[model samples]
Target: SSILSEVSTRARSKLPSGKNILVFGEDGSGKTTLMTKLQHGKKGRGLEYLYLSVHDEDRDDHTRCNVWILDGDLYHKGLLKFAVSAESLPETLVIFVADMSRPWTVMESLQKWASVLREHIDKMKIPPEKMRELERKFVKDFQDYMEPEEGDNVLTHNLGIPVLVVCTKCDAVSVLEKEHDYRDEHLDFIQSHLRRFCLQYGAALIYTSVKEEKNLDLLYKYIVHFTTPALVVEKDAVFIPAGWDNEKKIAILHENFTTVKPEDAYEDFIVKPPVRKLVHDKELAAEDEQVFLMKQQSLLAKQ
Candidate 1:
């Protein structure tokens, strides 16, 4: 057979109007609330929407975006394949929502959803170089918002996709503090734990509350910002740019977990390994031809 079996050519289609966004989080994490608030400013009851498609005409020209919200039950994760594929992977963004009311579960929620997203991205089999390019763009954007620092650890995990971590229900921060006995230190601890993971994934972080109407507009702006190519002005209250500044602030809460240079922990391994043991196998017993034939005949008869 010839290596070049056939040659064909086809006209390339134009790019889509906007990118596809994959949204996921645990149940009652305010995902639906956020989506409703984005679609309609006011909160309404029984607003159950699995998928939403909206357009932004504020720009000089109109742009459209396809938003797929995974059911909080996580049973719809398989639907991610329909949204993202080899052709659409380049124009995709992932938004992971975490509930602030239940601060105890924030880290766990982030970890679980992050693992799920990572697995699907891997399954897409995107080009390694293209993935690196995407990661570099996110990291560069993150670096722009904060100052540099020495001895800061390099991000360890890159999902090969753009991700935004939204901490919803910020209005309850005070309530959680007073009623739930969640202190400033407790909040700081949560921020620290989540910040490291966000940095590793090159994800932007936002605190949103629909009840208080906090950062709702900025959240929409971020959605539009990531989906299309446009200038995104950062809002301090809503947006926390990923960098060492956030990391250092979180470190002050717990001194024991502060970042340190590897040289500080340098040490020689004084202990040595034990000697290897060698063993010899005994010779196998020789089989008698007559006995082997009888056994084979018996096994064949049973078969």
Candidate 2:
């Protein structure tokens, strides 16, 4: 089985265009496997991407390189040693890959490593708070890294760097089917944890399965969409599912429209709107259309 051919075209396309994507992930998390898939395809060349694995052997030439796949452990150490070295920071994109089956623990480990990176900043005579602020910005810079220029901002907002959270190994149907007590068993909640991480960094979530090829094109779409300042939105709003409570919102609209008491449905006095047509019911008094529209618009605009 070969993924080399499939990936080589994409990799080659970037050479003349000055586009480079750096991929990193935990051991055995399919970083090599996925890269191979991209390069060779399902049935092509078997040589997996060993670009960085080979580069580390010499270590002397720290030349400005383009695309590479690196072990996560080495990345943390290298960044600390060469903090602001022009050769150290990636110029294009940084894709963090994680196994979907081990999402909770992996994220926890990554978070701990991030904390260590913070400590490294402190050891370098950088204020801890300033480093924290830099980290906060790094996460937001994920999208920015996908572009050609590093921009006016010097410190990398990792998020500005165009991040793709590759939720790998999703093709394991039996594994994906099991929703058995994940909250209690898993160390961190995938959506909640990833959401917080991405919010801090400004990265996009993408679930991928080499077996199923699920959401693969969506990854490309996001990459293309955020590569330019003109295409990117000023603020990428958090997506909250309708039924879920947005704790950040001070008040919910459903509070006013529920037939039953708001407290009953949401556990607290949290409102749950009735599914029926309460607005058009003949039993309720009819009012001026203008007033209703104004009120509706006002409520909709509320935070």
Candidate 3:
């Protein structure tokens, strides 16, 4: 009964002014450019473009959505504590940007910052069951687009939020192919690996290039679709609403996509170890020595 009362109280409490969307990536990952284009339909310069505010509305429900963008800097990560909370966890979204221009370093950037986001989410202490519930909610909301297979897992790193990896600067693919020796094989290999990785956590992946202004509208539509309680199928994309069985066409906005087994692609890549292993080893040794001294003291007292 007390638990029920607590839930009732929470449900009755005022809702947050808007959903919290966290955008993070390493420097020069085109994080700022994408946000600026979405907000103003053009690129922005420097730190002034770090944060952006935009409002979205649904005429049917007369609802307003307040979207906030966070600059992709490690120093700014401390701000996440204020934006994410147990109550708002269900509504939160994470957009992780990877710069396609620097394809070689893209994996490293993603792995490093994804680790950081996972760390903070671990601190939230949200129950696993609740996280699963939120996953089900999101899947149901977007069910028409993709169907989950049996034993499909949601919530990457146990972070109870939706994550979308936007690979920006895809327009430079031809340049990357010629100058950087990146070919279709390389691109497909990367996509396959990432697709498999994201599938484990029920995340979605999209490739965009601000220079070409590709998929900008789809990106915006997805943001509103995930946060708002309304159904929207963009005219350009192939989206079918829940129910009404007709010939369904899956949207193919970008190309060179494959869902190869992760293990097949795993051998082609090797990640570097975290920094400062020597210092970490010394700290561990010191901690072990202190533990040995404490044990000796306890034994002496017992004697």
Query: Highest TM-score: which candidate?
Result: 1
Roughly what TM-score does model 1 have, to 2 decimal places?
0.60
The weakest ten consecutive residues by lDDT in model 1 span 265-274
lDDT of each: 0.54, 0.42, 0.49
Clash tally for model 1: 0
RMSD in order of candidates: 16.3, 23.0, 13.9
Q: Write the per-residue lDDT of candidate 3 for residues 1-303, one digit (tens) a residue.
A: 599888887785433244555666446566656665665433332222233333233432322333445544545444665666666665566666776666545666677767777776665534556755666676556542433221132333343345666567666767655654344445555654455445444455556675544453344445444322212243111112112121111212113353333444333333212221354344445433578888989999997
TM-score winner between candidates 2 and 3: 3
Candidate 1, residues 63-162, lDDT tens digits: the string is 3456666654444445666667665564566777777666555666677777777777666554555655665686565444333431145544655345
Models ranked on lDDT: 1, 3, 2
Across 164-183, the per-residue lDDT of candidate 2 in tens digits comes to 44456655535433543222
Residue 259: error of model 1 in Å?
15
Distance from true location, Cα of 195 in model 3, Å: 1.5
In terms of lDDT, the poorest run of 10 residues in model 2 is 228-237
